[PDB]
Amino acid sequence: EKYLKSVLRELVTYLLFLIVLCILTYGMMSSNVYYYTRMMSQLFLDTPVSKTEKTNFKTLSSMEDFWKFTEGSLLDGLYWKMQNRSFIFYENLLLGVPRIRQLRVRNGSCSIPQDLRDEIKECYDVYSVSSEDRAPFGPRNGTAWIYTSEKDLNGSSHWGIIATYSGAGYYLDLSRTREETAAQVASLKKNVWLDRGTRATFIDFSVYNANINLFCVVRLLVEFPATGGVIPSWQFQPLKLIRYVTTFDFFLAACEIIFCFFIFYYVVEEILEIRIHKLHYFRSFWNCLDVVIVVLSVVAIGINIYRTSNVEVLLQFLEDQNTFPNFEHLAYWQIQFNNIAAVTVFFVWIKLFKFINFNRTMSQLSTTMSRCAKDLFGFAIMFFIIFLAYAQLAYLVFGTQVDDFSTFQECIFTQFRIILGDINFAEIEEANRVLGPIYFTTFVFFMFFILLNMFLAIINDTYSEVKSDLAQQKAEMELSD
Amino acid sequence: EKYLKSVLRELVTYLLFLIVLCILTYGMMSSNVYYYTRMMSQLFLDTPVSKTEKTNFKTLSSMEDFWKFTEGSLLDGLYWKMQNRSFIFYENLLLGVPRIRQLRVRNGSCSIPQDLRDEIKECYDVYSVSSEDRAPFGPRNGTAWIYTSEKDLNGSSHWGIIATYSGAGYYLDLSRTREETAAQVASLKKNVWLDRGTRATFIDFSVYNANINLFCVVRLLVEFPATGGVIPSWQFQPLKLIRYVTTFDFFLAACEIIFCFFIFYYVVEEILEIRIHKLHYFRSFWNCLDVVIVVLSVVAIGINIYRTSNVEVLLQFLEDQNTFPNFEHLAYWQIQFNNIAAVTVFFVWIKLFKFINFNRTMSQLSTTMSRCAKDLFGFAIMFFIIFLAYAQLAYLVFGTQVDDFSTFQECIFTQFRIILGDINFAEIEEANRVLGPIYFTTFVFFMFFILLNMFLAIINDTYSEVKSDLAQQKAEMELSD
Amino acid sequence: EKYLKSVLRELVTYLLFLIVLCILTYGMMSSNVYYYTRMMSQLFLDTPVSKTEKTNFKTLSSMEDFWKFTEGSLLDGLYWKMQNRSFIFYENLLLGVPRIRQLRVRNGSCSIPQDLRDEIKECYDVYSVSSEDRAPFGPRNGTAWIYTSEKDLNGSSHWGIIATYSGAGYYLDLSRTREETAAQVASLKKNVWLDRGTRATFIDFSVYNANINLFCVVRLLVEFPATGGVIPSWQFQPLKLIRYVTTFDFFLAACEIIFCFFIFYYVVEEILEIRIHKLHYFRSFWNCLDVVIVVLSVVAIGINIYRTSNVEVLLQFLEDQNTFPNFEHLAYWQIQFNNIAAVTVFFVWIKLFKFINFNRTMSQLSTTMSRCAKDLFGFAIMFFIIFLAYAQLAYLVFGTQVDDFSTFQECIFTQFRIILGDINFAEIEEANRVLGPIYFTTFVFFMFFILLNMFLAIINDTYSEVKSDLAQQKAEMELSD
Amino acid sequence: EKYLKSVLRELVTYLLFLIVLCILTYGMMSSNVYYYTRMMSQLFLDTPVSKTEKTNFKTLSSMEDFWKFTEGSLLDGLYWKMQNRSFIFYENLLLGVPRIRQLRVRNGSCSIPQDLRDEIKECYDVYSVSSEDRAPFGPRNGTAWIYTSEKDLNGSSHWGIIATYSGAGYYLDLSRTREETAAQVASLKKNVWLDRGTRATFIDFSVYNANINLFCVVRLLVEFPATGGVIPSWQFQPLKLIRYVTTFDFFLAACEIIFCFFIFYYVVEEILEIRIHKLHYFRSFWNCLDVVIVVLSVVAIGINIYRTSNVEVLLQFLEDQNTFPNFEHLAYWQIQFNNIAAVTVFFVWIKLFKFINFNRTMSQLSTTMSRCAKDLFGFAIMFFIIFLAYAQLAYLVFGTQVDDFSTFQECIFTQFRIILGDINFAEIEEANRVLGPIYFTTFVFFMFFILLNMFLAIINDTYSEVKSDLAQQKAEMELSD
Ligand SMILES: *[C@@H]1O[C@H](CO)[C@@H](O)[C@H](O)[C@H]1NC(C)=O
Ligand SMILES: *[C@@H]1O[C@H](CO)[C@@H](O)[C@H](O)[C@H]1NC(C)=O
Ligand SMILES: *[C@@H]1O[C@H](CO)[C@@H](O)[C@H](O)[C@H]1NC(C)=O
Ligand SMILES: *[C@@H]1O[C@H](CO)[C@@H](O)[C@H](O)[C@H]1NC(C)=O
Ligand SMILES: *[C@@H]1O[C@H](CO)[C@@H](O)[C@H](O)[C@H]1NC(C)=O
Ligand SMILES: *[C@@H]1O[C@H](CO)[C@@H](O)[C@H](O)[C@H]1NC(C)=O
Ligand SMILES: *[C@@H]1O[C@H](CO)[C@@H](O)[C@H](O)[C@H]1NC(C)=O
Ligand SMILES: *[C@@H]1O[C@H](CO)[C@@H](O)[C@H](O)[C@H]1NC(C)=O
Ligand SMILES: [Ca+2]
């Protein structure tokens, strides 16, 4: 009668905590941010490069296509001549200027083998910090032709497709009108700004939508591999820097204050329960889950105080509309805060299973799932050993031919897709006509037919044992009377 | 011997009821209505906008594409010059005129934040009834430039993609020939009829096929979001307003009279069974299903009497062939009647399980499925809590990047597709390269490998218990003799 | 010791029967007939209609596209001017001429409703034999403008997409060169040969490949619905009429004689076993399967004697190379013989399970699968009632919008694909935004989560009962000694 | 206490063996070889053939498209004019010249049937060694018009799509510049080099990337079937011939020496264990797996010594840069070595299950999987008989229409895809509208609903029996005390 009142107290606390958190994650995701990013993407990615071409930005193939993109579709997308400054789609203001930036490697950064020194003169290693070019090159008479260090253009290390590109390099800020920017890009193409030593080219800009009040930090990364070619990549990230403007935003700030108070409450409660039991605490499952929730929530509050709410670059940009707004770090911490927020909300919803042990069937199901975690963990070890064995088989066979097996983690995720049934078997069968079939049939027969059913066998036998033990307990208590 | 005759009586009633209902749902769905809507769709949606373009109506991107559509493909589709008035595909008569209609919002309907009042002048809020513009604008000298209320153009609230658009706005009826309509559309484009304040544009028309006798109420909705862009949408809805023309339609009207008599019979029978048992009635499953069937059938008869069979607008249109036929409400109640009819037919076919308890194995299967509904309901609660937890995780992570996770219900239905195996993992892995993988692998491992098999464990143990209890009952009755 | 010798006798008979049959079905399917049909298909279907168009034959939309096809891509495909008569791909001889044929309906074959008699003048019913036009029309001065009955052009009823088109109609044989055929097709287009009354247009021709010795009977059917539009369809069917040419074909004819002797043997054996047991014969499973095999094999021998080996039209064609070879019936009986042959081979391979009851585990598995057929049949009845209930729900909801739910059998097969995981959920969710989701989630939850696992529960309990009964039998026989 | 030290000894040996092997298979697969092959593929395959065409190399249709490819896209891809010799993508050196090669068949190599000898003059059999043309033809004044035997151009038998093409034929080495090569190809097209007798055309070349130090042996095979048409095929194979250049490659050679020492150790250990037990050795499972690993590793060491490390053709090429480097055999043994390496790594990871029998639950799972292999083998026999029966049904029905059922093994792998849920049901349903549906529904109902669940039933009953036998053993040992 007192434990039920305790569960009532920590339930009427927790449901208010969950309502506050699902209000915050209704205020974060504004209702149609998706259409903003898909209109920006279908403007800059999906449009054809020129009238005489059919390549997108998504399917670039060589470096001349990249010059046609920077001269053509990018300048038709950035500079909408208003029916001054350009409003993209006649709504989205282009903040300041876009910035193009290059990352180079040194000549002779690798090593040509001995018998081929007569033919091939120059080599260029795969991109690294040790291989990076610091020398000025070309006409040397501008910022685009002189190296600039990472701590002098306020950048950060971007994690691209095939490397981790640093924030330094050879930046050139563009201009406010289409004619000045086209003249600067033609001056870069004429003096050869992208040669054999280029390994990455960033195009950074930032737009602002005043209708729904969202920034958008576009980053278009083109990676030139050492193998020759072009790997395009993009990143559209909707910031929200100016909070206080609407009544609902004051409501969200009040819910932020209330959320900080709730996390203070739960941290103090878990410390008071850890002051009693020294280590009779992590031996349960719900106290460890409360540890995970309060650690992720303290990290979320630390990100939202120390990093995201630090709009020095916004007010510093709003003193002159002719520079480049450094919205890189705000977008990076917005991504980190979205990941921490989503994982915190997921474990808060998982925490609800302390409070639906109300019925007898719910107790049977919870006891069943708690008595099979040991044996499912052991079979998860065996299953993942055989699964990573097939993943390394597939990476050694198909790692040079198939997109779905290009890196090792992509081999793992391709095998989860093959288990579910999302196959592109045509490229596997034309990549290797012998082990393609043998890999595929043995992976279907020894996972989806045999090893998949073993998790299910463990769950069957555990559930039958739990139901029979409870029924036999009650039958013994009835035949003892 | 009397209960078997009672089951025989309520079986020879019910099978005639099912034959009447499957005759009605053979007369409703005429055999090839689908090709009529796909030829109308491949005329108006899938055709390229002009000769120099490759955009459809399905893939519009900006507002100039919409003007090229209204000037180009729409007028090549509506006005087939007959080898007067235009027969679409030389079969389908274009009833009257098409109507284009605009929904606007007021200038300054939102609020520009403080530090950006110097740069950005005007804002336009997301569409609502409070934000809607009522002021006349432009040249103000026609119906296209003056607001018209919802109750004065006989419209209704359309439920579009991103809002619930009202029926009011700035309508312009077009004309009978291609030249007059092209002149009116050029007069709209020249005087700027779609500006920054437009939030929706409807294009409504209605065709009639006299060969198979079906109307078709085309509604082409273009939504201009507050973010800038174009979301196209369409709705093709085959009415059938003139019933009595063929012998089979007199047969269908006779089956409608017979169906109303059967529903009178079943309602009186359920009231006579509810007059005996006051509440020893909903404690079963088949009486509650009869309640659901007679409620849905009374609602279907009410829709077919009070709403769908109300062709005042048809006979009112047939006094002058130069106006716009308001076929909005007939199409809306035809959609409602199709949903009620389909759900009524589904629960009538589910009702058949009163009458296939004839064999002993059928009794074993029915007792098995009736003894596991409690435990499958409890595990459905636990499964749906973990499932909605993953859906909110996916909505917070991918809700700004991926089409399949744009809204919350689309996150739920995308997760059902991931469980079945209909994945587009490329866009998930390029949206977020860390939690894309972690979300996907933990959702596969903790649903398709573990929580999916628990429903199956419940069904295994319940079926084994039921078969063993019946076999042990008969063995005890054999060893008692 | 005598039953084992009997099984040895009927095993060394049967394995020779299976080797003969898998030699016949290695001789029937020649090793690369597929590339012959895909080169004919990618010549006539996948090529663009003209240089200024992008439509295939597969994606025709209107009647002017069909005239551009008959004037353009068909005459560039049929008449390869040899580097006389035309060798398609410089290998495949075009036998004789192609024949184009039209099927019409009468004016006023339906009924215009009362209030619309002032506007719409003429109607044309959906195609049937009662609706068919017999009147001569147009200039009336040729075979293309005069009706010809089915028994006077040797045709047969084609089973198209939306009707069952008869063999009669308005045929026009084309000519041997491209210029004469283009002149005849231009004379058809100028005098308007396809008007509002056309319901089907066949294009029949036949090519012969002398390298691998195969005929190919191309039939291109364009169906013009009553709704207006074009439904294209095709049929490529590789005959083989001249048998005796290679040594392997004499070997195949010897295997045909040996197969007729084996079927004589099995029919006499089953009659001798039915003369003993009057009805203690169909009470087993393998005697009924032998009945199915000998009935299908007698039907296969009857088709191969009375119908397929009847090359009167081939030798009758080889007296003049300027007519049309009636290869319709030979292609139809070749399709029927391929279906009978494939089903006979499937049940012959199923018959092999009389002879792998050799081990004790094989006896356990066979007894298990024979003791669960009754209960799986009962649950197959319940499962198919709920499955057809969902299929009729989906046909009433989506039967006017979605290709995958166009007809009722396509609804059934689309639901099997949804169970496996081959979904196009985008068109379902844009067809109906309320019952699309509700139908999809309830079909996943009440099939793939609940009713799918019940077959598995039946198989689990039956296998556990069979293994425990055999183990308990041997334990009782060991504890009785 | 001594067996645990023995397991410790053969575990600290084996984990070092696994670390050495996963270092070798990190050095083999360089981190981004995939982007090198996809840039070569998107240069030579995915580019359009000319400016006025839309065909790739992947979708060739006839022989004039192949001449437009050899004159157009191939010469725009091979000969990048450097901003001498051509650097492809300004990085990849084109080694020497490309070689085009033709395989022909004789006139009259087949047999025209009797009644058609008047019409068709010449036939050409399907390609074989007996059918191959050895006669000189055309102008006869060069290497392109005179037969050259397989042992005089150092080729080997290529295993193409529809045949096994020999290494001989009519080769023509091209030249170093685009003008000379275009002149030679125009001289081949003008004098008709590809006629009716051509059955295959190889285009072989080899590029070298000095940045990441990889060769790439491009082979473009176009197969002209006897049916007329073009089947394109390609093969991109990244060699690595010059080993010693980097510090990591010296580390890899040291790991190769260490791997040869480990395989010497394991072979001597297995021979010492086979000298004790004569045949009490293959009766276990881990000794047979060690046999498989040491046989595959001795074969891998034999391939890497006797075949792959035999760079006579490289140093022989580096004496003159104007010939053709025979990199055929090095690419073939690199493919064989990748397959042997991947399968050896897979069975090494499978060998790890000797050493995770540490816990009691792991012992339960291993005993469970070892007691069900007999019954899963018996049901795998029954399942594969029914599965190959359906595969032969599908090959006889769909083997002339559908790509996914073209050959018999493709029917098997298409059925595994149908079981997982990767269906293209549209082409099956338009190939055969009766047995397409009946085959598909009976294959879903009698595999995914019934026979799939029987493996699972075997695993359920075996796991329940094993857990109950161990629990009953411990309960009997507790009730015996
Ligand atoms: C590149 O480096 C090579 C040697 O490392 C040198 O011979 C060559 O002149 C250099 N070229 C340029 C453009 O720096
Ligand atoms: C120096 O910079 C100017 C831009 O102001 C540019 O036009 C010029 O080309 C540069 N000098 C050389 C030698 O390229
Ligand atoms: C729009 O509103 C702003 C302030 O709300 C005003 O300054 C501006 O003049 C208005 N423009 C138009 C075109 O109404
Ligand atoms: C007034 O309406 C007419 C249409 O009759 C239109 O042509 C004209 O442009 C309108 N007036 C102005 C000032 O736009
Ligand atoms: C078609 O039939 C209608 C009435 O059935 C008639 O008035 C009309 O003249 C006919 N037209 C032709 C072309 O036969
Ligand atoms: C009569 O047939 C000829 C073909 O020989 C055709 O050219 C002509 O057009 C036909 N007559 C009429 C009046 O169309
Ligand atoms: C091909 O062979 C046939 C008979 O086999 C012969 O009549 C014909 O002249 C030959 N043609 C050529 C070009 O060799
Ligand atoms: C002989 O070879 C030359 C190439 O040097 C070629 O141009 C010529 O066409 C050949 N002779 C004949 C008769 O084709
Ligand atoms: Ca699946």
Author numbering:
A (entry chain B), B (entry chain C), C (entry chain D), D (entry chain A): 214 to 296, 305 to 702
Article excerpt on this structure:
Mutations in PC2 are responsible for approximately 15% of autosomal dominant polycystic kidney disease (ADPKD), which is one of the most prevalent genetic disorders in humans, affecting 4 to 6 million people worldwide. Here we use a combination of MD simulations and cryo-EM to identify and characterize PIP2 and cholesterol interactions with PC2.
To investigate possible binding of anionic phospholipids to PC2, we determined two cryo-EM structures of PC2: in the presence of PI(4,5)P2 to 3 Å resolution, and of PI(3,5)P2 to 3.4 Å. These densities are visible at several thresholds, and the peaks are prominent even in the un-averaged (C1) maps, which indicates that they are unlikely to be noise peaks on the symmetry axis but rather may correspond to bound cations. This revealed clear non-protein densities located between S3, S4, and S5 in both the PI(4,5)P2 and PI(3,5)P2 maps, suggestive of lipid and/or detergent occupancy. Although PI(3,5)P2 maps suggest that a lipid molecule may be bound at this site, there are few interactions between the region where the head group lies and the potential lipid. Returning to the cryo-EM data, we noted that with the more soluble version of PIP2 (i.e., PI(3,5)P2), we observed in the map a small outward movement (∼2 Å) of the VSLD at the S2–S3 linker region and an inward movement (∼2 Å) toward the central axis of the cytosolic extension of S6 helix in the PI(3,5)P2 structure compared with the PI(4,5)P2 structure (which may correlate with the apparently stronger binding of PI(3,5)P2 seen in the PIP strip assay). This is suggestive of an interplay between occupancy of the PIP2 site and the interactions between the VSLD and pore domains.
